[PDB]
Amino acid sequence: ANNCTFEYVSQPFLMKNLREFVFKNIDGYFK
Amino acid sequence: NYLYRLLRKSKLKPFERDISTEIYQAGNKPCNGVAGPNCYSPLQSYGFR
């Protein structure tokens, strides 16, 4: 469906309920 | 069938691709989607003989 490059299916991601995230894009990687 | 690019607005960080083809402009007058004066297509073939 319009140049499907990558797929990813894994464990549930979103589970006095403060949550924190950090996204960084370094040398061709997403962490 | 095998293509490559001349020029881009900025340098490439390692390990990525550029797929979309946009007509670059290097002047005050915009290209407006027309490859006329001061407008060049980015991709052309190798032409192997």
**Cβ contacts of B22 within 8 Å, gap of 6 or more:** B42
Q: How far is CA B47 from CA B2, B20, B26, in A?
A: 8, 22, 27
Return the structure tokens found at A28: 């061709």
Entry resolution (Å): 3.3
Cα–Cα distance measured from residue B6 to residue B25, given in angstroms and rounded to the nearest whole number: 13
The technique is cryo-EM
User: CA angle, corner A30, sides to A29 and B3, nearest 5?
Assistant: 50
Q: Phi and psi dihedrals of B40, rounded to 5? A: -135, 140
Residues of A in contact with B18 (CB under 8 A): none
Q: How far is CA A8 from CA A12, A17, B13, B16, in A?
A: 12, 26, 24, 19
Cα–Cα distance measured from residue A31 to residue A25, given in angstroms and rounded to the nearest whole number: 7
Contact at CB, B19 and A3, closer than 8 angstroms: yes
A28 has a chain B CB within 8 A of its CB = yes
Return the structure tokens found at A15: 């589970």
